[PDB]
Design a protein around this ligand. Structure first.
Ligand SMILES: [Cl-]
Ligand SMILES: [Cl-]
Ligand SMILES: [Cl-]
Ligand SMILES: [Cl-]
Lengths: 162, 166, 162, 162
């Protein structure tokens, strides 16, 4: 299995992502996305380009990426701080079941996986997420994929932020 | 016919359903009290599915930094906030809300330290064109400590391809 | 004519200010000092620095700034809520004439005027006041200078406060 | 001893009050007057009734009452925001001694005390002030009279305002 050959399921409607908010990243590749909460945002009313925004929140720090649909079931991201672009895909999505939401998404460096994010709001109980991670961590560079929530900062009264 | 004179006497409109706020996402703060909230984008978040207390969350986003406060409804049309980093509480109210009109959304909210105003946030997604917002800001300025309320969106940092984040 | 080149008359002795109390601001730059009564206060008996205090009173709101003499006929202000300093000067003073008191004072942001206050206790009849306002209105930012006493709140039996 | 029988010393000339400015309230009855600085103002030049004004300043909030002399060594107050009147008296005054100023004033609800204000600019060292407070605390409702200056807000570089 190589990164270019991973499943590319259709990007669900944006409202399906918003109704999942907030999510946590159970498995990620790089350290950057440990202990992280995901919130999706609709394009602003006056947005010229109507891009959505993904928020990756880690304590008092935040990474932001606008995204739009692209070819081959892709999401095309723009880093709001750097203007760097990336092409992402969904390995699967399972949003808004009666047991909540999960998905796994990725971006490729050719055959190797550059970044991986599996999010949920059900504490990792979706059987699809288990299968998906097992598959992804056998692609080249997928050895780096790890459980992301092990030893996270203590909270001060909020459930999904710290 | 006279404007309220102290913070404790400001108007307290019913808190709209959360959905009305989420559908306004994202907003910008046009007027704030402390300069912590200059150049800031607001995003509202529903309670997590597994949340024990069903608190919503307000995100105050300024570049690569974020301030987070959980909130729930309280009596007298209050929102009770819990700072997620410190655990400090505050009782907030809405001076007015005007969400999802044909010209977009605006509101102004505040929290008092007795008769003074401790914090003030006026948000919108229509570049400050709601006439309610103009008159609300004038009123709030006149209460004790309200002279610090200022326009919050001058000279904000340049963007790298996103409209509402930087 | 720019703000840095406006006149700087000697700050009168504090007693002359206190004898003028209370004043109203007839012309100001920002909206903050609309419908406002000025009262000057001597340093507290126990004050270590012996700063005087200017009180700006608008209904139930009070803004307070300690001040002392500085170089070049300046008054150095300390906002009592924030510890922020500002350097002020008098364009002119005309205190305790047989027709009462007036003055115009200002603070600069380099060449533009950041704030302007013209006070009196004679309903704006001092001819010096008219000429000072006409000059200040011509400095950069001075177009915002405006008459400050239109449509002020109704009173409940006191003359200078509401 | 009831409120109606408390001493009524002559109201000193206004200039004595102004020379005492600013004062702090060390003892009060209602907690409105905690952490409060008092400033006296002469009548506005143009005022038709020539009423003086008492300012009660607590941080950024100000209460204002015009006042004139009435019979039996009374001062008749007019709340500038609500138009409400009240007859006040001085239990004693001791202004502008070589150890500074102190006074205690009150207003009655028949035989009970409705409000009490003991002011000074010397941190409570006037022996008259101790005796006066003792006496007032024993009239009906005087049990509410408390020390007004515990745990007041921290300052930002001004001595008498915050
Ligand atoms: Cl993702
Ligand atoms: Cl808010
Ligand atoms: Cl001034
Ligand atoms: Cl008094």
């Amino acid at each position: 299995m190589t990164c270019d050959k991973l499943p590319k399921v259709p990007v669900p409607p944006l409202e399906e992502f918003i109704k999942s908010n907030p999510l946590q990243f159970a498995y990620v590749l790089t350290d950057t996305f440990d202990c992280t909460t995901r919130v999706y945002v609709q394009p602003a009313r006056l947005s010229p380009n109507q891009a959505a925004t993904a928020l990756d929140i880690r304590g008092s720090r935040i990474i932001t990426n606008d995204f739009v649909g692209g070819p081959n079931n892709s999401a095309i991201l723009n880093n709001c701080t750097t203007g760097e672009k990336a092409t992402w895909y969904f390995q699967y999505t399972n949003l808004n079941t009666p047991n909540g939401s999960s998905y796994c998404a990725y971006t490729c460096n050719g055959e190797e996986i550059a970044e991986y994010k599996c999010a949920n709001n059900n504490n990792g109980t979706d059987p699809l997420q288990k299968q998906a991670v097992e598959v992804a961590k056998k692609v080249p560079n997928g050895d780096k994929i790890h459980y992301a929530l092990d030893n996270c900062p203590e909270h001060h009264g909020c459930f999904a932020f710290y």
